[PDB]
Structure formats: C-alpha cells, structure tokens
C-alpha cells in the first residue's frame, strides 16, 4: 500500500495506545503490533496493526533501534503526525 500521513490527537494524560515491535536491530521496521481500544491511535481511525512507522513528526525512524524509536515516539505531544506504510 501507499505511504499515508495520519494525524493523532494525544492529551497529555494519555498514551498513544499502540504496541510496538521491530526496529533496526531486528532488521525490520518499527511496527504496530496492537491498537488499543478507545485510545488516540484507535480513535484517529488511520493506524492499523501491521503498519510500519516510517517517521513521526518528521523524525525518520526507518533506521533506528527499538528503544530509541520508542523513546522518540513517547516524547511526542498534542497533534502528532505519523508517516506509515502497509507494504
């Protein structure tokens, strides 16, 4: 499928609602493994299990290890743009 840019609105008191696997050390993209019901990722309607997260708010995560990608993702606030692809 094509690259999509998807907006998510996250309140400060909540998580994104996404489980993440993969990363550079695994030789695979940062991947969405679960979308948790009622949380921002579910609510936005545009993120799905199996999507690769290529970038978030213009931070390229195509070649980043799991931990560091998760840290960057966790630091994002408010209206957050995900660049994703389901290949």
């Amino acid at each position: 499928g094509p690259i999509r840019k998807v907006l998510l609105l996250k309140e400060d008191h909540e998580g994104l609602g996404i489980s993440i696997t993969g990363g550079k050390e695994h030789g695979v993209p940062i991947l969405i493994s679960e979308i948790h019901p009622g949380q921002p990722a579910d609510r936005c309607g545009g993120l799905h299990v199996g999507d690769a997260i290529l970038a978030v708010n213009g931070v390229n995560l195509r070649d980043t290890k799991h931990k560091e990608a998760v840290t960057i993702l966790s630091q994002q606030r408010g209206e957050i743009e995900f660049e994703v692809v389901y290949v």
Partner: peptide, 5 residues
C-alpha cells in the same frame, strides 16, 4: 520485545 506507547 514489545513496547507500549
């Protein structure tokens, strides 16, 4: 390894 965000 799985993380939640």
């Amino acid at each position: 390894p799985t993380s939640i965000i």
